[PDB]
Amino acid sequence: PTHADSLNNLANIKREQGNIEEAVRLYRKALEVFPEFAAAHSNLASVLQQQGKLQEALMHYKEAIRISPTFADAYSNMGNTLKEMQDVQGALQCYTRAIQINPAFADAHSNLASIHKDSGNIPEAIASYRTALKLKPDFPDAYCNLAHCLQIVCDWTDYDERMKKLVSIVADQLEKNRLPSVHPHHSMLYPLSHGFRKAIAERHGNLCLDKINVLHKPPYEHPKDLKLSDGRLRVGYVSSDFGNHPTSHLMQSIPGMHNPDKFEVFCYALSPDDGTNFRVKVMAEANHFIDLSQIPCNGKAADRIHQDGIHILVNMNGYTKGARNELFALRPAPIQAMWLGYPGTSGALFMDYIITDQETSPAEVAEQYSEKLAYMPHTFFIGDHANMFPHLKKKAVIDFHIYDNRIVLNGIDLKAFLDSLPDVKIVNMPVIPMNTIAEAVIEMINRGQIQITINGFSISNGLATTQINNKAATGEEVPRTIIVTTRSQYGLPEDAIVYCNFNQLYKIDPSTLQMWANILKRVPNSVLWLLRFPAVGEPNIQQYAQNMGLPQNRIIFSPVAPKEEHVRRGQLADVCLDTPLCNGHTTGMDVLWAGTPMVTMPGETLASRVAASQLTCLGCLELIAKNRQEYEDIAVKLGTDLEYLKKVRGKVWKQRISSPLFNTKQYTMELERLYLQMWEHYAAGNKPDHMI
């Protein structure tokens, strides 16, 4: 029937509008008029999938394919559903089957590429995106995702046109009020204006509001005082990252450090228990731990939050994997603030504050954010390194004249081992002379042996960490052996400067590699140290470096290492060269914990300024460049003026303890101060305003 057709078409536009509830109702009326309506089934499945009703979606997709066995669109959209359910094999069958039916089906090629990208097969993902774009040259989703693949592997072919193309695509989609193909979590990597980046984020917040409007929940009424909570402020931390994830590696100590007399801490996990000590710790130390992964419906979950009586609800995800921002769109709490996991604005009106600081987000630049600024006193960034990696608070070296980063030892029991040795000299850095002991250590390293015993102490090869104690390798336990780290373990020169960056390669852009090459040309006795992150980016970096006048052997790549080895091996470098496009954030705390000075050039985006905010708190303004020339000058100076390098390294080494940077107790008390500032402001009936 054509009556069914008009119902189906009306529902389609209702969906476009984001009236999810209305679309569903019309699709069902269509199937009531004309039950064998394959397209209606497939369209109903699609709006059901949008609501999270994945099993019901599947049922209607299979119905549409039953009616119409070559319905390629249904296979492709069905595979999207299977992908959301984590059934990657199913999705592959669906996508591949759609392409067999119609080899000119661009969307199906694009959807297959995304599967390849997710599994890390960037070469195959790039190839399938190019088919999509060949079959359908105006294809923003496929173009923007291809651009991100090329970013991941440091493919800069036609880089400048690509950037211009991305801005134009985003410009066109934002005008037409569609959902931009550049993901908000990627938009700092491209030369979009701040308003475009804020607009991309806003479009994604709107998606959340559409999905919760179909719930018809009335506003929550919020506490106006602290009387039902015995005078305590109720803070709820929402995260899908309570477990083995950088977010827990940064803030896992903070819940248990809250003051129980003034604060009551609720942790709302959006992920299931992954079994790691990170999840154990947060569960054990929060006042209340709620596993909202058991509660997939956002209406109940926000109910569950509202009943706990939360005054401040902290969004730790923004637009990252596992987020459930519908919860915040429902505003179960009177104050909702973005905290630490999302380095950008949400652009969403249901977020009141972004917890940042003066250096990361100077007021002059407040227009990049939809949220009011909430300044922590130093840096908003934090790290749990003092708790996870205390064996790195002290080190000793071997005098194989005296380097602090060629052959290093760390250990909780290091002092006792040193006291068992005949000759040891201090410089304060203990130095072990090249005796019989010192040769056994180097013997173990050279021979690839896993461990040895000296004077009863266990001496571990820093490369064999997951065989000696895998929980210590990941940061879940503190190593209970003495660990030996050397430049020889990584092919690093004993007799030259080592510049390092341990970030994912996608943070490098053409300008940054050019700066780095300028630096290494000026410091002939030096190498750049990078990670295979991923390894398929290695040959592109090598080539662009050689086209910049840089021999292959000046750049030394290593594999990604387990967490503790990654942090520990940063001691081997002299200097970290930070990525300006997007700094090291977590990785910036890792490198500073090793005592390694970091040169940075803050841009304007929040993600381009985190490193400079860390160094300001650390108290090392001399490492913060105002432009590329200053960046190269600071890096070349640290690589040539060796007494100055010695001075700056001692400053970092000492300041990582005496500054607030790694001081989670002080940070938790600053955060508390800032919370009461937020609350009192609202408790006097004011709306969110900037908190400095």
């Binding site: 979590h185 950088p246 990252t320 990604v560 387990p562």
Partner: peptide, 12 residues
């Protein structure tokens, strides 16, 4: 890492 996992931030 090879022989394990290194979780990172990733878009939803």
């Amino acid at each position: 890492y090879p022989g394990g996992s290194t979780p990172v931030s990733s878009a939803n």
